Chains A and B, each alone.
Chain A
Amino acid sequence: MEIKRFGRIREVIPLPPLTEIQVESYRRALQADVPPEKRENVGIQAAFRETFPIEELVLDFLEYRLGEPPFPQDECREKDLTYQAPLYARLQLIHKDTGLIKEDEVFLGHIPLMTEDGSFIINGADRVIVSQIHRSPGVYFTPDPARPGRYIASIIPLPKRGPWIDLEVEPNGVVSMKVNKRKFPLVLLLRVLGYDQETLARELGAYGELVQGLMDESVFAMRPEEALIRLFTLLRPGDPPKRDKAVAYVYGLIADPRRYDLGEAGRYKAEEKLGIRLSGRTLARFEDGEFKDEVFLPTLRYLFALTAGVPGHEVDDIDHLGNRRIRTVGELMTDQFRVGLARLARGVRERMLMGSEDSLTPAKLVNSRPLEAAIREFFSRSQLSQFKDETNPLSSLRHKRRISALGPGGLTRERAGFDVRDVHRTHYGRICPVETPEGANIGLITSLAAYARVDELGFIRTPYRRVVGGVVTDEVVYMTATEEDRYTIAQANTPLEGNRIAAERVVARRKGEPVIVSPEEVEFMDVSPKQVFSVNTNLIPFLEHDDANRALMGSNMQTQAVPLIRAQAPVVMTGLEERVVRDSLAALYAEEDGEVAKVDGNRIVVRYEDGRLVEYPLRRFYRSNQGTALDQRPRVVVGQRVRKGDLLADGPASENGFLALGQNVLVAIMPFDGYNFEDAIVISEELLKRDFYTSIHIERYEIEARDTKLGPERITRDIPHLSEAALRDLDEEGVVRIGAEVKPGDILVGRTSFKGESEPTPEERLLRSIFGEKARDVKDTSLRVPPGEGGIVVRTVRLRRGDPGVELKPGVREVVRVYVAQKRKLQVGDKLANRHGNKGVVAKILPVEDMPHLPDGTPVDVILNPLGVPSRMNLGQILETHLGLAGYFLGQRYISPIFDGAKEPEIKELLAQAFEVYFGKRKGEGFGVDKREVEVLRRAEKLGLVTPGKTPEEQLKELFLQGKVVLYDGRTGEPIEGPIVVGQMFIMKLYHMVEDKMHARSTGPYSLITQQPLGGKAQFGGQRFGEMEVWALEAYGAAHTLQEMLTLKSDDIEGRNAAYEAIIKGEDVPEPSVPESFRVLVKELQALALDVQTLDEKDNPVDIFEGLASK
């Protein structure tokens, strides 16, 4: 079909690789493809160099290598394995006395490998490591909140790599240093570095009143040894001040690169702030037997200069993105790697004492368990390690680009106020101002902007075009926020003829402040409007017409869109939807130019230029983390000539290579009989008839058979007391057959368990005796379909013990997995949304004859209430509908870029050409204006919509240019009294579906200690009737309703039993008894040595334990 694209802005560079923030970070961390001699000291390599040599015999690090993965990715997901590589290190043990050297390559366990798309496979499940924003290491000067004319100097290193130091000028006038919560006069620390009054007086004298607060006679009297011992006694009271002990502690606090690490970014920021050059990442050095200063004197000089008001000295904005940096996958993982390595080193030193001091190898010295555990802990249990969101391809791409201020080494949610959550001016071009969570995490979880990239230091940079004279170059410079602040940057839409700025006054930013400026003053210019927003936000057409609060929901909800069997790309696109599919890695493309040899549902064979025959297998109906079906479909035919980068297969949610999150439906904006009320949505049954909004879902079920002290669990078709009706669809072995339809209550995998030893009650003795049937030894433990679930069985995996290639966890004889698939039609309670933040649940499905319809007989698909628009201020959905109407009749789709889009005149032009197709056709077919069309026209000229005196055709065209048409009520045949807005809208079916959420319980499982119902649908849980619900019952004065909630419907054991028995017998429910959790409370207070006594009116004890707990 035709695709007409609007907008004149030419973007000189394409979007960067969208997952590069993940992929490149990890590549740098492993340095796997670099030959060892060529490795830089970074990532894993830097961790080894930091941990070694291990001194005590001396064990030294030579080099590491990474092997190949024991199993490929597909296999790991199948077998619940982690995709990982064996890590080895060549280590040499040396005896410094003897000279003896034994060298060996020790196996350190495995390290997880990142897949092509930037994710991990950890125990079979796909995971994402979310980048973490935090304070850049460095030296900052912030204002002291208590004392206005004073400031605090904070020296910050990398996390866990050293203490923070705070410099303050106390009211008494002496300059104090705060380390690990202890304060002392800084003069003492200066003396340890070897500074003398002569050097300090001349250096800081320029600032009058402050230098005297630094002068302390007693400190200068003592030599560097006495000052160092004095400081150690101040910092570590009670620890004997052995001279070697003090040097060791202070060295570790200041000069040790192993215990103190400023960043590489920390070093640059300090050097840049204080105007010096650092020999390393430490605040000082240990050289020639003494300590030699690096940092302290320059920060002190700047600190005094700030207090005195010397020109050129500023306080630092700590939310500026120059002072805030990103810790990506490589850095986070390497940190945990460094931790595991330190633990392993502890074991080495401990092993270097015991055993024989003579015969020892590196293999005998190293226990790798601490390292394996540190890495295993990071990937499974870290907060930044998240279950991948792969609801649709855009979901995971977005997940990889998210930025969190939470996690280890970061903000808590209550401790995070407005400042961090704010959109800083420096977020421009770096962090999307739109895409952030609604609710408690707002401003804490953010998203990388589309053109943004994280530099080697960890700062987010954004591209700008150089502007020389009035000429805009094509050379793009990626800038940090700090460097961006130097220039005057014109907006990307400023008019150009050729490379020249064509306006007399241009719109630019200087340090974020908007200003009108001459082309002579323009140093750079934005690459595109796309650079201000995230990828999801960049997918919203007419975004300039939507209030940001709704665009937020629009961005976020594209993440929740379900892949549809009929999915289509929107008729109004933004031009990013092709790139998103390509970077997502869902779609399949041709490597080189070639011709297609074979095309199957399962595979595509391509013959390239090289002559080599390449076969691409297709992933068919695979279950994602969220259970949506990932399946690839061949888009080419046998004998087709393809070029390099031509589409071979569509992934999920893509149509011919374009991102397809939904369907294009015909919408009428109008109230409908209250089924539209308060965001509810009315849809036509035609949508189900033609399988729009239908999605495939797969659920995985699992069961283990294990050894017991009572005998084996067995997976079997022989299950006590079950009819052949019940076993019909089970195979010989007891597993449900592929292709069977399973419904709630149905057996998936049959299983028997040996009955726990019990004496049958005398009732069972008599019952067994009456019927003459031996009580079986085993019980029916079979796995069944839970309430509300079921579908068609598409797969079964069975793994026994003692069969080739498989070993289970101890005690487990066999494991069975049953994959059940369901084709889900859209239904009442399902949630729909568009890209502008319009969201609603389907409240009514009308038959086609009730649907409002056009004069030519076409019923609309969806009816959206206009009451949702004005308060929300998202008008983009309206413009999308208007342009969607033109495209419906012209048979075309559009690309309207964000902020450089189709404007109203152009949309009107298309609407005019469309009206010719919608109407001119009719006049030739021999039909004139309808009577009811005249009536609608009458009310319309009363509304000022049409010009009086024009022909009926002319007036209908005037309305059509306003995007309104005459609409017939399918119930009556009479028109809607006014012309109504109708058009094509792009609407998605979100992941929140009633089938998943509907739940009810009569009685069910109870908790161990409290005896209260369990929680959640998966546990067959009860609803929580919480503190606030109780208040409601209290305010109503419903005492008996409330008492039921508190006793018979919860933890009153005697009461709940009696209530059930009464209801099945038709009696009224009995009076409640004591709730079991009150008995727990009494006993818990007795465990605390408090005697809690229930008393009667005579103040005599009442026993709520009924004699059972008293001797």
Chain B
Amino acid sequence: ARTIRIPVHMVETINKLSRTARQLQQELGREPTYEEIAEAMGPGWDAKRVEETLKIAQEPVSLETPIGDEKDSFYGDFIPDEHLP
């Protein structure tokens, strides 16, 4: 499912974190902080690891993503090239 492939066990961990955050938001009436997710995940989990796990789980977005209500421009057109001198 992911453009950047993730090991099945890591996908399992990511999804657990989703369910957990959703539980916390369902009991708390608002999105949880990193720390609240870390308590709910048990020992071994601190706020730093929740953030790092969410960072790893970020999916790319399309270069062909539209800018504007005309069909005339793409997101990639606004990205400079840092490689070529």
Q: Which residues of A are in contact with B by a Cβ distance under 8 Å?
A: 67, 70, 86, 88, 106-107, 109, 363, 367-369, 383, 807, 810-811, 1005-1009, 1011, 1014-1016, 1019, 1053, 1057
Give A1014 to B81 CA distance when docked, in angstroms. 10
The 8 A-B residue pairs whose C-beta atoms are closest, nearest first, are: A1005-B80, A810-B55, A810-B54, A1008-B81, A86-B29, A810-B51, A107-B26, A1006-B81
A1019 touches B78 (CB 8 A): yes
Give A363 to B69 CA distance when docked, in angstroms. 39
- B65–chain A nearest beta-carbon distance, Å: 11
**12 additional contacts (CB under 8 A) given A369-B22, A1007-B81, A1011-B84:** A67-B29, A86-B29, A107-B26, A109-B25, A363-B26, A367-B22, A810-B55, A1005-B81, A1007-B80, A1008-B63, A1008-B79, A1015-B77
Task: From known contacts A86-B30, A363-B26, infer whether A811 and B55 are also in contact, taking CB-CB under 8 Å.
Answer: yes
Give A1019 to B81 CA distance when docked, in angstroms. 12
Partner of A1053, one of B55, B58, B84: B84
- A708–chain B nearest beta-carbon distance, Å: 11
- B54–chain A nearest beta-carbon distance, Å: 5
B78 touches A811 (CB 8 A): no
- Chain B residues whose CB sits within 8 angstroms of the CB of A1009 once the complex forms: 76
Q: Which residues of B are in contact with A by a Cβ distance under 8 Å?
A: 22, 25-27, 29-30, 33-34, 51-52, 54-55, 58, 63, 69, 76-81, 84-85
A70 touches B30 (CB 8 A): yes
- Chain A residues whose CB sits within 8 angstroms of the CB of B80 once the complex forms: 1005-1007, 1014, 1019
- Chain A residues whose CB sits within 8 angstroms of the CB of B77 once the complex forms: 1007, 1014-1015
From B23, which residue of chain A is reached at the shortest CB distance? A363
B26 touches A106 (CB 8 A): yes
Which of B26, B55, B79 has the most chain A CB atoms closer than 10 A to its own CB?
Answer: B26
B33 touches A807 (CB 8 A): yes
- Chain B residues whose CB sits within 8 angstroms of the CB of A1005 once the complex forms: 80-81
- A437–chain B nearest beta-carbon distance, Å: 14
- B18–chain A nearest beta-carbon distance, Å: 9
Which of B22, B63, B77 has the most chain A CB atoms closer than 10 A to its own CB?
Answer: B77
Give A880 to B79 CA distance when docked, in angstroms. 51
- A368–chain B nearest beta-carbon distance, Å: 8
- Chain B residues whose CB sits within 8 angstroms of the CB of A1057 once the complex forms: 85
- B21–chain A nearest beta-carbon distance, Å: 11
Which of A67, A807, A1006, A1015 has the most chain B CB atoms closer than 10 A to its own CB?
Answer: A807
Which of A70, A368, A1008, A1053 has the most chain B CB atoms closer than 10 A to its own CB?
Answer: A1008
- A932–chain B nearest beta-carbon distance, Å: 59
From B55, which residue of chain A is reached at the shortest CB distance? A810
- Chain A residues whose CB sits within 8 angstroms of the CB of B55 once the complex forms: 810-811
Give A1011 to B77 CA distance when docked, in angstroms. 10
- B52–chain A nearest beta-carbon distance, Å: 8
- B83–chain A nearest beta-carbon distance, Å: 9
- A404–chain B nearest beta-carbon distance, Å: 11
A810 touches B26 (CB 8 A): no
Which of A67, A88, A369, A1007 has the most chain B CB atoms closer than 10 A to its own CB?
Answer: A1007
- Chain A residues whose CB sits within 8 angstroms of the CB of B63 once the complex forms: 1008
- Chain A residues whose CB sits within 8 angstroms of the CB of B81 once the complex forms: 1005-1008, 1011
- B73–chain A nearest beta-carbon distance, Å: 8
- 6 cross-chain CB contacts under 8 A: A67-B29, A107-B27, A369-B22, A811-B55, A1006-B81, A1009-B76
- Chain B residues whose CB sits within 8 angstroms of the CB of A811 once the complex forms: 51, 55
Give A363 to B26 CA distance when docked, in angstroms. 8
- Chain B residues whose CB sits within 8 angstroms of the CB of A369 once the complex forms: 22
Give A807 to B29 CA distance when docked, in angstroms. 17
Give A1057 to B63 CA distance when docked, in angstroms. 27
Give A811 to B79 CA distance when docked, in angstroms. 21
- Chain A residues whose CB sits within 8 angstroms of the CB of B69 once the complex forms: 383
Give A67 to B30 CA distance when docked, in angstroms. 11
Give A1014 to B73 CA distance when docked, in angstroms. 12
Give A1099 to B81 CA distance when docked, in angstroms. 36
From B34, which residue of chain A is reached at the shortest CB distance? A807
B51 touches A107 (CB 8 A): no
- B61–chain A nearest beta-carbon distance, Å: 13
From A1016, which residue of chain B is reached at the shortest CB distance? B78
Task: From known contacts A810-B54, A811-B51, A1053-B84, infer whether A1008 and B22 are also in contact, taking CB-CB under 8 Å.
Answer: no
- Chain A residues whose CB sits within 8 angstroms of the CB of B29 once the complex forms: 67, 86, 88, 107
B78 touches A810 (CB 8 A): no
From B18, which residue of chain A is reached at the shortest CB distance? A369
Partner of B76, one of A106, A383, A1008: A1008
Give A51 to B51 CA distance when docked, in angstroms. 36
Which of B25, B34, B78 has the most chain A CB atoms closer than 10 A to its own CB?
Answer: B78
Give A607 to B84 CA distance when docked, in angstroms. 68
- Chain B residues whose CB sits within 8 angstroms of the CB of A1016 once the complex forms: 78
- Chain B residues whose CB sits within 8 angstroms of the CB of A109 once the complex forms: 25
From B69, which residue of chain A is reached at the shortest CB distance? A383
- B32–chain A nearest beta-carbon distance, Å: 10
From A67, which residue of chain B is reached at the shortest CB distance? B29
Give A621 to B9 CA distance when docked, in angstroms. 53
- A812–chain B nearest beta-carbon distance, Å: 10
- B53–chain A nearest beta-carbon distance, Å: 9
B58 touches A810 (CB 8 A): yes
From A407, which residue of chain B is reached at the shortest CB distance? B69
Which of A363, A810, A1009 has the most chain B CB atoms closer than 10 A to its own CB?
Answer: A810
From A381, which residue of chain B is reached at the shortest CB distance? B66
From A1010, which residue of chain B is reached at the shortest CB distance? B77
Give A1015 to B74 CA distance when docked, in angstroms. 11
Give A109 to B55 CA distance when docked, in angstroms. 23
From A1020, which residue of chain B is reached at the shortest CB distance? B80
- Chain B residues whose CB sits within 8 angstroms of the CB of A1015 once the complex forms: 77-78
Give A1011 to B81 CA distance when docked, in angstroms. 8
- A109–chain B nearest beta-carbon distance, Å: 8
From B33, which residue of chain A is reached at the shortest CB distance? A807
